[PDB]
A paper describes a structure:
Tripartite systems of the Resistance Nodulation cell Division (RND) superfamily are composed of an inner-membrane RND transporter driven by the proton motive force, an outer-membrane factor (OMF), and a periplasmic membrane fusion protein (MFP), forming a tripartite pump with a contiguous exit duct. Among the major RND actors in drug resistance in [name], [name] transporter works in conjunction with [name] (OMF component), and [name] (MFP component). Archetypical RND transporters operate as a secondary proton/drug antiporter exploiting the energy associated to proton transport in their transmembrane domains to power the export of substrates through the periplasmic pore domain, 60 Å away, via long-range conformational communication. Crystal structure determination revealed that [name] as well as the E coli homologous AcrB are asymmetric homotrimers for which the three monomer conformations representing consecutive states were designated Loose (or Access), Tight (or Binding), and Open (or Extrusion).
Firstly, the 3.2 Å resolution tripartite complex structure in nanodisc revealed a 1:2:1 stoichiometry of [name], [name], and [name] with a [name] trimer, a [name] trimer ([name]-trio) and a [name] hexamer surrounding [name] and interacting with [name] in an open conformation. The α-hairpin domain of [name] contacts the extremity of the periplasmic helices of [name] while the β-barrel domain and the membrane proximal (MP) domain interact with the funnel domain and the pore domain of [name] respectively. The overall structure was similar to that of [name]-[name] stabilized in amphipol. A comparison of solvent accessibility, binding energy and electrostatic potential calculated from the Poisson-Boltzmann equation has been performed to gain a better understanding of the principles governing the interactions involved in the [name]-[name] and [name]-[name] interfaces. For [name]-[name], we observed a complementarity of the electrostatic potential energy that was not present in the [name]-[name] interface. Furthermore, by calculating the accessible surface area and the gap volume, these two interfaces had a very different gap index resulting in a high complementarity for [name]-[name] interface and a lower complementarity for [name]-[name]. A simplified estimation of the binding energy at the two interfaces suggested a stronger interaction between [name] and [name] than between [name] and [name]. For [name]-[name] interface, the six helical hairpins of [name] established a strong and stable tip-to tip interaction with the six helix-turn-helices formed by [name] trimer in an open conformation (in agreement with molecular dynamic).
Author numbering:
A (entry chain A), B (entry chain C), C (entry chain B): 1 to 455
Write the structure that this text describes.
């Protein structure tokens, strides 16, 4: 009979509800369908990203290693399952010694020889008190923990691919907007050079208009470098090259993603993968306590074989040479120097170590979901304010264009208004990128994109 | 006999004094009470911070794992100490074999069965030359390194909780100043809207007063998220949530911490816990060299038991069946093919690796303490030059307020000085937060808070 | 015989050429001399940096651990190589037991005290099918992987030392320009104080002049702190202190690094050390399959000894007590419970894991070299624009100095032009530092400085 104690899951050391305050919105309560059960095909609505994630889900190498670890742990589980059964083997022996006359039976030094081949098992421990079954269950729980870790690696890879793709999508728009600002500065320098060549401006204004262009083209260079260094960072995450037959993507202002229900915090114990990984490692540490307890109890070993024995090698195949052996053995320790007790304390300590690691994983998940809820609460007001700033800059540019077309303002004032519009659009692009990255990280922290479609 | 070499502590490859220069102050020499002897209750002068650290030293799970690891290594040391004793047990054996008619002693095939219940040991290695004692000493030193690791984890947790609390305390005042800047901008927009509706201001001055207001609103919405996102970071480090009945904390302008003596570079060898951990690992490797040395010498084992044996089953514990067995064994390897010398060389290489890691731990501790001393040397004049800036900006604000009260300037010019006051106060708050974070990290680097009060 | 499968190096899962776009130059094709064959002495053309590397390569404690791990794994290889030879040792025995009246040959309880002193081998497994040979090959391949890891650590240390020294060289020039800016601000404050004393200006201008000098005293302190905290990191990387007999260094405007050719990605498989380390790990995992295949085949163990056996204690000297024993045995498993097949599957899975890790090492090296080439293609135009900006600011300042020498402008405007000149001159230093850091990292990713001279 077994000796593994009864497993009881520890309570969550978090608050009962997600945090409130000025940053957070109202709590939605329970979830009809959780964010884990929502597949990543319905979450990401950009069809270019839906193909890039599909490329990265079988061309990546971290996901491939995390997939192969599950097979590596099944191969370790089958080994530990195999030790309950006896190891039937063929064992051929030979012995040739020369005892002296004192120790030999004939009172004379004579060379004695015995040979024989048997079929049978040696030292086959009969798992009566549940030791080898406890090690089997420990290996099975470690396999389940690896199976959860593969899903966690897939969710991390999906959120990383979406983050890098949105980063490239933002930096290309930044490059185009800086390419417009450089042309504005170039036109302003051309008008200042004309005004200096006719004799109305001095060299002091020509040098300032030169410094503006020479400061803009350095920004153009250091944004071209960023576009290339994000293309390389996406190519490394994909595992292969970027596919050529890709569908046309969406702009940053469109609704790229779908909102997900946060749900209750107690759902995080049921859906997030690494919490389940820590729980299964806790169950393995629990199953080790049975193997530590069974060392006190008696162990039963067995040795049994049957075959042919003879004096010389020629008498092996002959009839009448049948032989068998049957050796049972029981063993019970009485006095160890506190050895088995200290091993039992070692198992009981590592169970509490896994309890503490499980609780720390729950607390980390709660913290990085509350951060995403704070970001979702505040980024709506932040982007509404930035979009109103962009609209007011557009109205200022249209009014400056009316004063230019009428004839009151020269062209340098209109060029001064264009880059003031472009700065406001650049800041909007950066804030929208931060809003999308926080939502992608919230989707990873809530259970992630393990399923492809919704269940 | 013992073959462990005489342990010698290696010299620290650092300079004899803390570095000088125009960033550092002047070295004070020796220290009557070094920083490890100063507890964290008399160091942090905030009564709220002390209660938060009192919560964190009980509820944080990362400290709990390190508090269980020392007991795990204690159990491992007890297991390795238990090897110096014979394992006494009850062995109930049995044997029933059928042999052919030539190897049997009668020339006829028969069954030679016996049974026996004995009590005693087997393979008890008599530690004469000190192999198992050297392994016991290695387990003892590996136990002694783990409580130094626990002390280092406690110092790191104390510095992390203090840094997170000061970051929260600074970010709340940053939010409080951002709200006032937005309240300034809203009045400056309402006055421009009134002046536009009256007829004096064009619609090119309304739009830029609108863009200023939206630029303030976006900063408010991104500081609220920061306050929430480091409230969650404090809650994660505290283990449990923030308590409700808290004392009244101190503002950033007051003396929040205590000045601490730097001391000498030769004190880091005595008081910083990770250097003592790296030293005890070196003592463990020096102990393992003795266990590798003992393999060249003859090993002595013993097998001795006493019990009752019989030919058939029913006559086991009946009288006239007492028996013993005594077996000494001596082994000395003559020709291992360079195996034992390779194991000895491997032990020496492990000792040299621990030497190099010990010296690297000393060098990194010196680098951290010298960074903290440089920052302590320069932040005093940095914050002096920063407080003079806020004093001059406040004098500018009061002179502009006198001009407004007299009737020379309008209410649009006074608000442009109030914003400069707010900008200078925000920069002062940021520099003060940097000064306090550097002093908390300097307190950690010198030996940290492991004691609670002064010793 | 040997059961190790044939090793086939996998294909590079990268593109056949480095990427091309707006940020890259032209692909120079194959390199007649590679980047890994260029020594670091010829690459770093600064006579101070060469001496700093010639100190750091001897005094660093990470390179010492990496250069001792190759000796540890050489000893671990020699241990496994020693297991092919039989262990020849002397064995002293002895047995005293009182069998009961049933199991003794006399019919009465007899005491059978025998002894023996012999020399020979026990349990010597004959490696006919290549199990221990494949284990020796696995240990040899892991030794070669550690050999590659040492060179990878040396290249990383060289790149870190060069980056830290160039950062110190940049920050000292930043200190000098900040001192010049502070002197300009102090002269402006003295002129404004004099104009306030005569009565031309008001206190409203004196406070604004005071704020600008406090803002420079607050920056001088933090740049002094940056220079000290960077010197401490350089002394940490060097191991020992900075030597006093340093030769004269060079400025950042002078050409410090030799241009290295990029070559082809197919050279990355040949000369980067952390690709060869992942290759030798794969060869070790390939030898592990030959180690796992040999479990299905018969193992031939041997015991063989010769010496003097006797009954009394005094019989071990004289003749007539000699003895030998020769005991061969073969074992062949027939039925296991899927244990050997699971171990073979585990070996194949551990081969495929190292296949995936080798491909990921190739992809990481490709991404790093591609980022370095994207930096090299853009930093030329960025630095050209920045030094043209510095030249235009110098011409503007010289025209302002002409207007001051003539009599039109006062000293307040001439001093105002110098601050813009210093701002451009210290943006150029940051851009030059970023270019040199990217070039050092591109040299490290291409194969790095393993050799001192050109090979």
């Amino acid at each position: 009979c077994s000796l593994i104690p009864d497993y009881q899951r520890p309570e969550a050391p978090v608050a009962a509800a997600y945090p409130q305050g000025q940053a957070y919105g109202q709590n939605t309560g329970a979830a009809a369908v959780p964010a884990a059960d929502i597949g990543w095909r319905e979450f990401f609505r950009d069809p270019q990203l839906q193909q890039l994630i599909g490329v990265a889900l079988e061309n990546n190498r971290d996901l491939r290693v995390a997939a192969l670890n599950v097979e590596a742990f099944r191969a370790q589980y089958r080994i530990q399952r195999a030790d309950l059964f006896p190891r039937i083997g063929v064992d051929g022996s030979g012995t040739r010694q020369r005892l002296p006359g004192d120790l030999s039976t004939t009172g004379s030094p004579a060379i004695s020889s015995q040979y024989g081949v048997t079929l049978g098992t040696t030292a086959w421990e009969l798992d009566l008190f549940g030791r080898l079954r406890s090690l089997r269950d420990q290996a099975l729980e470690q396999y389940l923990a690896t199976e959860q870790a593969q899903r966690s690696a897939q969710t991390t890879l999906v959120a990383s691919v979406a983050t890098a793709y949105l980063t490239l999508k933002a930096d290309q728009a930044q490059l185009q907007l800086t390419k417009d600002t450089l042309g504005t500065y170039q036109k302003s320098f051309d008008l200042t050079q004309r005004s200096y060549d006719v004799g109305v401006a001095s060299a002091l204004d020509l040098r300032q208009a030169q410094t503006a262009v020479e400061g803009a083209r350095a920004t153009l260079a250091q944004y071209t470098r960023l576009v290339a260094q994000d293309q390389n960072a996406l190519v490394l995450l994909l595992g292969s090259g970027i596919p050529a037959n890709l569908p046309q993507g969406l702009g940053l202002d469109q609704t790229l993603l779908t909102e997900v229900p946060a749900g209750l915090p107690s759902d995080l114990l049921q859906r997030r993968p690494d919490i389940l990984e820590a729980e299964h490692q806790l169950m393995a540490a629990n199953a080790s306590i049975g193997a530590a307890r069974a060392a006190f109890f008696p162990s039963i070993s067995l040795t049994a074989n049957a075959g042919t024995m003879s004096r010389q090698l020629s008498g092996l195949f002959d009839a009448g040479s049948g032989s068998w052996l049957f050796q049972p053995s029981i063993n019970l320790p009485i006095f160890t120097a506190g050895s088995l007790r200290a091993s039992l304390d070692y198992a009981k300590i590592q169970k509490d170590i896994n309890v503490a690691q499980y609780e720390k994983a729950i607390q980390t998940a709660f913290q990085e979901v509350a951060d995403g809820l704070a970001a979702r609460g505040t980024f709506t007001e932040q982007l509404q304010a930035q979009r109103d700033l962009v609209k007011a800059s557009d109205e200022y540019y249209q009014l400056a264009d009316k004063r230019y077309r009428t004839g009151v303002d020269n062209y340098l004032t209109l060029l001064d208004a264009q880059r003031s519009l472009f700065t406001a659009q650049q800041q909007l692009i950066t804030d929208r990128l931060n809003q999308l990255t926080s939502e992608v990280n919230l989707y990873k922290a809530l259970g992630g994109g393990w399923n492809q479609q919704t269940v």
